[PDB]
Enzyme design. Structure first.
Site, PDB file in Angstrom:
ATOM      1  N   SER A   1       9.691 -22.660   1.325  1.00 53.80           N
ATOM      2  CA  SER A   1      12.485 -19.172   0.261  1.00 53.80           C
ATOM      3  C   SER A   1      10.281 -21.882   0.416  1.00 53.80           C
ATOM      4  O   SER A   1      10.277 -22.230  -0.771  1.00 53.80           O
ATOM      5  CB  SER A   1      11.049 -19.629  -0.081  1.00 53.80           C
ATOM      6  OG  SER A   1      10.624 -20.608   0.850  1.00 53.80           O
TER       7      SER A   1
ATOM      8  N   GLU B   1       6.154 -14.919   8.963  1.00 59.27           N
ATOM      9  CA  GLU B   1       6.560 -15.993   8.054  1.00 59.27           C
ATOM     10  C   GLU B   1       5.740 -17.273   8.222  1.00 59.27           C
ATOM     11  O   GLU B   1       5.431 -17.953   7.233  1.00 59.27           O
ATOM     12  CB  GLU B   1       8.040 -16.346   8.266  1.00 59.27           C
ATOM     13  CG  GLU B   1       9.015 -15.251   7.900  1.00 59.27           C
ATOM     14  CD  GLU B   1       9.294 -15.216   6.409  1.00 59.27           C
ATOM     15  OE1 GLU B   1       8.603 -15.941   5.631  1.00 59.27           O
ATOM     16  OE2 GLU B   1      10.177 -14.430   6.015  1.00 59.27           O
TER      17      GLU B   1
ATOM     18  N   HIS C   1       4.740 -14.777   4.616  1.00 59.92           N
ATOM     19  CA  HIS C   1       5.765 -15.334   3.757  1.00 59.92           C
ATOM     20  C   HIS C   1       5.395 -15.127   2.299  1.00 59.92           C
ATOM     21  O   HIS C   1       4.252 -15.386   1.889  1.00 59.92           O
ATOM     22  CB  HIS C   1       5.900 -16.834   4.080  1.00 59.92           C
ATOM     23  CG  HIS C   1       6.895 -17.556   3.231  1.00 59.92           C
ATOM     24  ND1 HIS C   1       8.259 -17.468   3.439  1.00 59.92           N
ATOM     25  CD2 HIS C   1       6.725 -18.405   2.189  1.00 59.92           C
ATOM     26  CE1 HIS C   1       8.884 -18.216   2.542  1.00 59.92           C
ATOM     27  NE2 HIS C   1       7.977 -18.797   1.774  1.00 59.92           N
TER      28      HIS C   1
HETATM   29  C1  M8X Z   1       4.091 -25.429   1.143  1.00 60.12           C
HETATM   30  N1  M8X Z   1       2.740 -24.862   0.849  1.00 60.12           N
HETATM   31  C2  M8X Z   1       2.970 -23.514   0.169  1.00 60.12           C
HETATM   32  C3  M8X Z   1       1.701 -22.665   0.061  1.00 60.12           C
HETATM   33  C4  M8X Z   1       1.962 -21.157   0.416  1.00 60.12           C
HETATM   34  C5  M8X Z   1       0.992 -20.255  -0.401  1.00 60.12           C
HETATM   35  C6  M8X Z   1       0.877 -18.770   0.067  1.00 60.12           C
HETATM   36  C7  M8X Z   1       2.046 -18.249   0.909  1.00 60.12           C
HETATM   37  C8  M8X Z   1       3.373 -18.184   0.135  1.00 60.12           C
HETATM   38  C9  M8X Z   1       3.773 -19.481  -0.566  1.00 60.12           C
HETATM   39  C10 M8X Z   1       3.458 -20.790   0.177  1.00 60.12           C
HETATM   40  C11 M8X Z   1       1.899 -25.827  -0.062  1.00 60.12           C
HETATM   41  C12 M8X Z   1       2.232 -27.289   0.121  1.00 60.12           C
HETATM   42  C13 M8X Z   1       3.164 -27.974  -0.665  1.00 60.12           C
HETATM   43  N2  M8X Z   1       3.250 -29.302  -0.241  1.00 60.12           N
HETATM   44  C14 M8X Z   1       2.358 -29.483   0.822  1.00 60.12           C
HETATM   45  C15 M8X Z   1       2.077 -30.646   1.586  1.00 60.12           C
HETATM   46  O1  M8X Z   1       2.742 -31.799   1.293  1.00 60.12           O
HETATM   47  C16 M8X Z   1       1.137 -30.556   2.595  1.00 60.12           C
HETATM   48  C17 M8X Z   1       0.492 -29.333   2.837  1.00 60.12           C
HETATM   49  C18 M8X Z   1       0.768 -28.201   2.102  1.00 60.12           C
HETATM   50  C19 M8X Z   1       1.705 -28.243   1.069  1.00 60.12           C
END
Ligand code: M8X
Ligand SMILES: *[C@@H]1O[C@H](CO[C@@H]2O[C@@H](C)[C@@H](O)[C@@H](O)[C@@H]2O)[C@@H](O[C@@H]2O[C@H](CO)[C@@H](O)[C@H](O)[C@H]2NC(C)=O)[C@H](O)[C@H]1NC(C)=O
Ligand SMILES: *[C@@H]1O[C@H](CO[C@@H]2O[C@@H](C)[C@@H](O)[C@@H](O)[C@@H]2O)[C@@H](O)[C@H](O)[C@H]1NC(C)=O
Ligand SMILES: *[C@@H]1O[C@H](CO[C@@H]2O[C@@H](C)[C@@H](O)[C@@H](O)[C@@H]2O)[C@@H](O)[C@H](O)[C@H]1NC(C)=O
Ligand SMILES: *[C@@H]1O[C@H](CO[C@@H]2O[C@@H](C)[C@@H](O)[C@@H](O)[C@@H]2O)[C@@H](O)[C@H](O)[C@H]1NC(C)=O
Ligand code: NAG
Ligand code: NAG
Ligand code: CL
Ligand code: CL
Ligand code: CL
Ligand code: CL
Ligand code: CL
Ligand code: CL
Ligand code: CL
Ligand code: NA
Length: 526
Positions: free
Chosen positions: A195, A322, A435
């Site tokens: 989410s 997802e 997702h």
């Molecule tokens: C959690 N990821 C969200 C990106 C996706 C984008 C498209 C699909 C729908 C929304 C989610 C990014 C991320 C945040 N922190 C990270 C971290 O620490 C290591 C590696 C990656 C990340």
């Protein structure tokens, strides 16, 4: 154009939507800005103003780190904030139908982003289509994220935890006190979110202080029992202490720590936030909801299991793929720019990335359950298995478990399985129905015929919008006019759910029964 609220007059702006009009109030403040001595505290109530507040543009988004993994790529940058980052970010938005409604049902959106990112001003959360098409009022708010919203010295009121959840709650309160002046019905409020927004919605169902602030709830790809959603008091404290170490704010008096962290610039806090986890994952929630004895009086598993939640209707669902989005944020052999055929060795490497704290036997057990297939020579076998592992563990099985436990206490629940891949999706085909990419259908963007969606997608969005609005107004997500498939209630025996797609909605039973038996029965023992 001008509405008197209980703290002062606010001025909106007229939007043209589909040959009609929506009145939008963008950027109404709902708390004192949590700056200075107010940083890390619960949101404080707002002092009255005498002039006309101009709510004609989105406000500041809350401070947060931005995704820079794919610069210039719309598929990731569409989720990055589109307004100035600032600690002064406790604002909300209101879309009301024109002409002004008399007693409209209210939809309150809570955005996701892992409790570390997100903002209500994103294009895919524009509530003007819902207000125009279904004549509901749409409300959305910014709430503090990251350490600024969820730093926890549990029990200390200088940093009690769950501040972003209390931000959300204070906005729900604002709707109770003010939405009637906008033509809304405070007695007919449905929360929805995706989410971490969905996880937030599920915790408002658990928090006694939110029970009088809404009627019904919609949970898209998230619930508090998902393994990324709640931090134990142990990690919460160890993570606060790590950030103090990294900032040079290590003190003995735990209060003097918070004072030291209040004199740091937001950037210093934000850049240190990342390395506070010892072994993170792409789904790592560094600073998230905790058991604070205030918003959350006990471990939420216990509350759910023992029926200690608001008795009402829920709508819950998940998307077909997802897990795929997260694989290109660290899993070896994966890339959005090729078909990501990985080997067995790369799959095993991938589990280490997504299950860093798990024993060898635990990872072998994941492998055992997901690597017995039809044709062994299928080259995408391992690529698809890892996505399914991440999707089942982090989204599908917790959502189903939440819905089972919730419906066991007598309440009507409706479960959906979204399986349409948007025709405009900029991510590659192997990632499937990712997702986050049901949101634009829920908000009715494909109703805008100028946006290069197909005809079947306009139809599907139209049906989904009507079902969501009927759930909010009436507690029953049917589309009754165009002879749609009836959406049955999800019962713990039969576990019927509805599939959402452009080629016939179907009633199905027992989603991912075999996989979720592994994740819910076996795996928590390891
Ligand atoms: C959690 N990821 C969200 C990106 C996706 C984008 C498209 C699909 C729908 C929304 C989610 C990014 C991320 C945040 N922190 C990270 C971290 O620490 C290591 C590696 C990656 C990340
Ligand atoms: C898919 O691509 C990944 C990632 O490689 C990068 O992106 C590509 C699009 C291309 O521009 C490469 O030059 C880039 O390095 C590939 O992963 C690499 O694979 C090699 C050999 O297996 C390995 O030595 C590297 O460490 C990998 N790099 C990673 C995981 O970041 C992968 O091989 C490609 N898959 C296919 C099927 O072509
Ligand atoms: C608040 O808004 C008042 C109205 O300004 C309006 O803005 C333009 C874009 C047109 O819509 C027109 O109707 C008005 O001129 C301002 O007069 C006032 O200065 C504003 N106050 C602040 C503090 O920004
Ligand atoms: C507005 O409507 C109120 C009733 O709302 C309805 O009942 C609650 C319990 C929910 O189920 C909600 O979904 C319904 O729409 C009235 O009591 C109230 O007087 C009305 N006020 C005005 C000004 O019309
Ligand atoms: C329902 O369908 C409308 C157009 O479809 C036409 O009307 C319906 C009642 C059927 O007779 C169908 O065969 C016709 O082609 C849409 O304009 C409307 O938005 C649809 N409503 C929903 C909620 O999906
Ligand atoms: C946080 O946990 C890690 C892992 O055990 C540990 O090394 C570190 O010392 C802990 N932080 C503090 C401040 O003790
Ligand atoms: C730490 O916090 C304040 C200092 O301003 C005060 O209550 C006291 O000096 C300290 N409390 C404890 C329990 O050490
Ligand atoms: Cl201070
Ligand atoms: Cl934008
Ligand atoms: Cl219609
Ligand atoms: Cl499937
Ligand atoms: Cl449809
Ligand atoms: Cl069956
Ligand atoms: Cl299945
Ligand atoms: Na399936």
């Amino acid at each position: 154009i001008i509405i008197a609220t209980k703290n002062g007059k606010v001025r909106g702006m007229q939007l043209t939507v589909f040959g009609g009009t929506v009145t939008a109030f963008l950027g109404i403040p709902y708390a004192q800005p949590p700056l200075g001595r107010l940083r890390f505290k619960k949101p404080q109530s707002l002092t009255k103003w005498s002039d006309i507040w101009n709510a004609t543009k989105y406000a500041n988004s809350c401070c947060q780190n931005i995704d820079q993994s794919f610069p210039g790529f719309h598929g990731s940058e569409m989720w990055n904030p589109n307004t100035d980052l600032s600690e002064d970010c406790l604002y909300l938005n209101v879309w009301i139908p024109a002409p002004k409604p008399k007693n409209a049902t209210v939809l309150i959106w809570i955005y996701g982003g892992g409790f570390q990112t997100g903002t209500s001003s994103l294009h895919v959360y524009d509530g003007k289509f819902l207000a125009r098409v279904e004549r509901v009022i749409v409300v959305s708010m910014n709430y503090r994220v990251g350490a600024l919203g969820f730093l926890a010295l549990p029990g200390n009121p200088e940093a009690p935890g769950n501040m972003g959840l209390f931000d959300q709650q204070l906005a729900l309160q604002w709707v109770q006190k003010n939405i009637a002046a906008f033509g809304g019905n405070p007695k007919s409020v449905t929360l929805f979110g995706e989410s971490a927004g969905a996880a937030s919605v599920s915790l408002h169902l658990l928090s006694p202080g939110s029970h009088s602030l809404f009627t019904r709830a919609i949970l898209q790809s998230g619930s508090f029992n998902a393994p990324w959603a709640v931090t134990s008091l142990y990690e919460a404290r160890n993570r606060t202490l790590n950030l103090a170490k990294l900032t040079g704010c290590s003190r003995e008096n735990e209060t003097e720590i918070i004072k030291c962290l209040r004199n740091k610039d937001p950037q210093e806090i934000l850049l240190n936030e990342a390395f506070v986890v010892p072994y993170g994952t792409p789904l790592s929630v560094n600073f998230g909801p905790t058991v604070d004895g205030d918003f959350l009086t006990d471990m939420p598993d216990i509350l759910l299991e023992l029926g200690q939640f608001k008795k009402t209707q829920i709508l819950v669902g998940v998307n077909k793929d997802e897990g795929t989005a997260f694989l290109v944020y660290g899993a070896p052999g994966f890339s959005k720019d090729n078909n990501s055929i990985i080997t067995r060795k790369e799959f095993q490497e991938g589990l280490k990335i997504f299950f860093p704290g798990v024993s060898e036997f635990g990872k072998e057990s994941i492998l055992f359950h997901y690597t017995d297939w039809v044709d062994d020579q299928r080259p995408e076998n391992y690529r698809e298995a890892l996505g399914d592992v991440v999707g089942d563990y982090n989204f599908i099985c917790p959502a189903l478990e939440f819905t089972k436990k919730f419906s066991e206490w007598g309440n009507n629940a409706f479960f959906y399985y979204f399986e349409h891949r948007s025709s405009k999706l900029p991510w590659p085909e192997w990632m499937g129905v990712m997702h986050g990419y049901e949101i634009e259908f829920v908000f009715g963007l494909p109703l805008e015929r100028r946006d290069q969606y197909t005809k079947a997608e306009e139809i599907l969005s139209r049906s989904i919008v009507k079902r969501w609005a009927n759930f909010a107004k009436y507690g029953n997500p049917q589309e009754t006019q165009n002879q749609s498939t009836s959406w049955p209630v999800f019962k713990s025996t039969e576990q019927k759910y509805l599939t959402l797609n452009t080629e016939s909605t179907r009633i199905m039973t027992k989603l991912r029964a075999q996989q979720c038996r592994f994740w819910t029965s076996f795996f928590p023992k390891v």
